[PDB]
Amino acid sequence: AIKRIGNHITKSPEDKREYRGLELANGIKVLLISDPTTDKSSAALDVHIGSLSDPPNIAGLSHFLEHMLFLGTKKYPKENEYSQFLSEHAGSSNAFTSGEHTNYYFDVSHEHLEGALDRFAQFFLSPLFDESAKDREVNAVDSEHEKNVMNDAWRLFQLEKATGNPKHPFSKFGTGNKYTLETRPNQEGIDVRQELLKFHSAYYSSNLMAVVVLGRESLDDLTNLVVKLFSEVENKNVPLPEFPEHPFQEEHLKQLYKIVPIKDIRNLYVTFPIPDLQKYYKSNPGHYLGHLIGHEGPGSLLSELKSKGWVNTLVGGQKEGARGFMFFIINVDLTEEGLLHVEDIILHMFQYIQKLRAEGPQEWVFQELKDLNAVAFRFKDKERPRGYTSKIAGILHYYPLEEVLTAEYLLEEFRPDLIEMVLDKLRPENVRVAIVSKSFEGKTDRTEEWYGTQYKQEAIPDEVIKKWQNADLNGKFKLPTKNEFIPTNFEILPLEKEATPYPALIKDTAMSKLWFKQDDKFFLPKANLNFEFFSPFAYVDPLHSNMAYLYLELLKDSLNEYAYAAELAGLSYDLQNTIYGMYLSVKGYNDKQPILLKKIIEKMATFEIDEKRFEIIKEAYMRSLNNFRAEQPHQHAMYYLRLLMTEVAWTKDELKEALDDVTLPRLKAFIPQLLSRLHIEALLHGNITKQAALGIMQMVEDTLIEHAHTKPLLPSQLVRYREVQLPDRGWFVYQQRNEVHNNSGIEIYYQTDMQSTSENMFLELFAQIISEPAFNTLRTKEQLGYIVFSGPRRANGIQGLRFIIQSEKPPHYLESRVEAFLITMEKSIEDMTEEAFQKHIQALAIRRLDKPKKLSAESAKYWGEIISQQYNFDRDNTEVAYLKTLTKEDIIKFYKEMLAVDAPRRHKVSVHVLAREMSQAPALPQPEVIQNMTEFKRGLPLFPLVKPH
């Protein structure tokens, strides 16, 4: 068909992408995306056809068809010719048939609209369905079924599909194999390929297409480009695949299934066939319901059961069904005290329902959630366009030409009748039970044919059901109050006359040190926040470290019950242990930032403790401690990395004797002594005011002085720790025999100098020239082992060079391999040509040069300068200036005294981490063994700090 209607689409005015939606006369829904600013011009072709829409003779006929629809035209019957086009134009095409939709989609390079369109549109007129392509692709569908044997999600998906009403055609199968798709149909005389021709012609080409192209030229260009060529499809009017009856017809209510998964998981899946609410889309009942389900507040059943500890995690929520019916699922991860009390958890669900009964419908939670999601959905920033097309094409089928964007995301009216329907629908009479545990071995014997999972019928006795339905008697269930707190104050602040290109020290006292520049590349309502804590006590004891660690644990554990909705309102934060103390960082929108900021400050400022919760947290991390004693050799090697590069780091054994004497009054008295004196440096960024930032800083410091009169720190005590000096040619090493792993680990480290002008580009460029030829040679060409890494390592504000490499070798022999690579680089000094140099410096420059894509991207790096006290935020420009400065003669200079073996300024580090049981040899000096690590690092020097900027 050729027909067009359309207008100015309600395009959510933060976006500038011009839009036009329509449908052709033959049942082809067409959206037209005109983005003249794009590079990758995309396209999509979705048909609303389920995997259950196959004729009953061939299960998965649509799956194998769309796996075979690409092959052979009358213009180009070659196999990958359209794929050769997309090979010419950097394209990644993909397609599927879902349970509702048979979709096809791709993109093109920049402008090859009619090129890809003509290489694409010939699938209709002559579908060849080549024989060897069929015989290979049926093995691909068998492999698709086989990789569906292991993914538990689609196993339980198909278990939901087939174990309903077996006569009703919801019980058909989706993927297919060799046997049920090839072996049995053609032996009935019903040949496959002629049925493929019939199933694409009379059935596919009839109706239900929902397509979209992403053009970029103009509106009328794409209009007469694509509306013209897709007259090739014409309507044959198939009946609509719809199941107006639910399948769960009375063999299904209160019916158990003990399911064996692949992975050892503990899960109860509770199913509700619920009516079609596609017409009820202006309310969004069900996902507002699931908002109420996984909600965490006062009287939260989540708060109840995790306070009881009975749950790992849960979700309840609406499942999109078919055109006739819909579903509703409740999915929960369990504990043993959850496992023994599942039915009571269901009873708790019933008490939650009874809580809903005591409140009925409430306008205000819907109103605030609605307004928040509305302002959010306008202020959703941008979008990965590919896949977005598939999404909108997924809902172009269900909505008219303007009701697609703000479809479910713009609610309209309060519908208490739908609320009382679903409260009336969600009943114990309505429950379908699916229990997923790996401990279901043996007693479960009626095994799945397609996948081999074991299930039982074994229905619920009526004592428990009757016991459920009369006893609706709730306990600690209480109302969660709203915490909205006005995010409408999002007006973008224009930058003042004080326009400096970086966050500046705008406020400095003995207590204050304030740093803030706002948004330039993004112009966002969010703001991101970075906050310094120092205490001396955080480096002094294993005992008090465990204390403060678990202190932060139970602490951030606590207000998360409050902070669920607020961070659910898109306001994230961070409490993180450091060796300096804690670490604070907050990110997010300007809804409630100084307010909730102050709430957090006061809350962590004064907090109370429960003894049982104390001891359970203690024991939980106690059992976490001795778990660590068998890490991976590269992971535990990274532990020795952090262990052999410091002033002191207390070991897990140091921690393990230390927990033997821990009491709650000890740290409970110690905490204000612990927080007795601090300095806080604040890094700030985003849509805020300089003078308001001054007031917020004064606020938080005065708040803490109000709490416990935390006095300012001293410059005479703000100390940092150094990296140790080798005896200028003495390279030292020792070994660590592992227990479990039979791989022998080893990792190298070096010390050039500080992050001066030269040494940064030295280490990075050198790291890059041991990236590609070494990845070419040692890991690829030699295959010494699987775990092979080569890369940087920044310790104590000093860079260096690590090799996270693990195999089963004599490590001295592997060192000899390393030394062979050093001779390789010796030859490669002159062999770095002009071109290797130029490609090499420009690739590291592109590695180096990158504008921010997030407001937090540069902030972590700035924070790295902060924790190293650097603040030259254009030292990367200095890095570019030195990248303009390296010569080939420098790497002679860099090799002789720094990199060689006779190198008089040699700073080499290595450590063996042995196993569980473990062409030119230079005159290496024999290193020592390192037994007393205390006496090892006891007598050696340290390194200089900064002549300042």
Side-chain angles (χ1 to χ4, degrees), residues 584-639:
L584 181 59
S585 182
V586 176
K587 298 179 185 182
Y589 288 102
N590 202 1
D591 191 357
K592 60 191 80 174
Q593 285 171 351
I595 302 167
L596 179 57
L597 175 62
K598 185 180 179 181
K599 181 175 174 65
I600 291 166
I601 295 304
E602 293 171 353
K603 178 66 175 175
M604 67 91 204
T606 50
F607 181 68
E608 296 178 353
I609 309 298
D610 294 332
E611 171 66 33
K612 294 187 288 184
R613 182 71 268 171
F614 159 73
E615 187 64 31
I616 295 166
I617 290 296
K618 182 255 180 64
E619 191 273 333
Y621 188 63
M622 181 66 201
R623 185 179 56 83
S624 176
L625 287 175
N626 49 1
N627 195 2
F628 193 80
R629 68 174 179 85
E631 294 295 323
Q632 293 300 114
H634 79 281
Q635 292 172 356
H636 199 68
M638 287 184 280
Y639 176 71

Side-chain angles (χ1 to χ4, degrees), residues 419-457:
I419 296 168
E420 191 63 32
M421 179 268 289
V422 297
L423 176 57
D424 200 4
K425 185 60 68 177
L426 294 174
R427 287 193 186 276
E429 63 189 1
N430 197 9
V431 178
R432 178 172 168 83
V433 177
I435 311 168
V436 180
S437 176
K438 192 67 179 179
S439 64
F440 288 158
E441 305 297 328
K443 291 184 180 181
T444 58
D445 288 328
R446 182 183 293 273
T447 308
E448 187 68 27
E449 292 85 4
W450 289 274
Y451 292 105
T453 186
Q454 294 170 352
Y455 62 93
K456 300 301 287 185
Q457 188 70 40

Side-chain angles (χ1 to χ4, degrees), residues 209-254:
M209 287 83 162
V211 310
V212 53
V213 292
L214 186 146
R216 72 179 305 278
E217 312 299 324
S218 74
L219 297 172
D220 294 331
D221 292 331
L222 62 80
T223 304
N224 61 9
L225 190 147
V226 303
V227 175
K228 177 180 70 176
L229 190 56
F230 287 85
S231 65
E232 61 188 2
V233 181
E234 193 65 30
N235 193 358
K236 297 180 185 178
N237 198 0
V238 75
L240 279 73
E242 60 184 0
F243 288 155
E245 63 175 1
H246 69 283
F248 290 161
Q249 297 170 356
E250 193 270 333
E251 295 177 353
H252 308 87
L253 302 175
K254 300 172 287 296

Side-chain angles (χ1 to χ4, degrees), residues 743-821 823-842:
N743 287 317
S744 64
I746 189 171
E747 188 169 3
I748 314 164
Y749 184 78
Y750 296 97
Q751 289 171 350
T752 66
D753 201 359
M754 298 179 71
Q755 291 87 21
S756 68
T757 301
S758 64
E759 308 296 327
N760 291 319
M761 295 298 106
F762 284 168
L763 190 274
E764 289 189 359
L765 196 73
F766 180 69
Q768 195 191 14
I769 206 58
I770 56 96
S771 70
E772 174 63 32
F775 182 73
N776 194 3
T777 303
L778 299 174
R779 187 257 182 85
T780 302
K781 187 187 291 183
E782 292 187 357
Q783 291 179 356
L784 298 173
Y786 181 73
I787 302 299
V788 174
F789 176 77
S790 67
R793 178 60 177 87
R794 274 75 183 272
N796 298 116
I798 304 293
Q799 294 178 346
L801 188 63
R802 72 178 185 176
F803 294 92
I804 309 162
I805 180 168
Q806 169 185 352
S807 179
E808 186 175 1
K809 296 292 184 182
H812 47 87
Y813 176 76
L814 201 62
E815 285 290 328
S816 300
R817 295 290 185 183
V818 170
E819 298 296 325
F821 181 71
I823 300 168
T824 304
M825 295 308 292
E826 176 185 3
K827 189 175 180 179
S828 177
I829 291 168
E830 296 177 353
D831 301 333
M832 175 175 280
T833 63
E834 180 68 27
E835 293 180 353
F837 178 73
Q838 287 297 320
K839 296 297 290 183
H840 180 63
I841 60 96
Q842 187 57 253

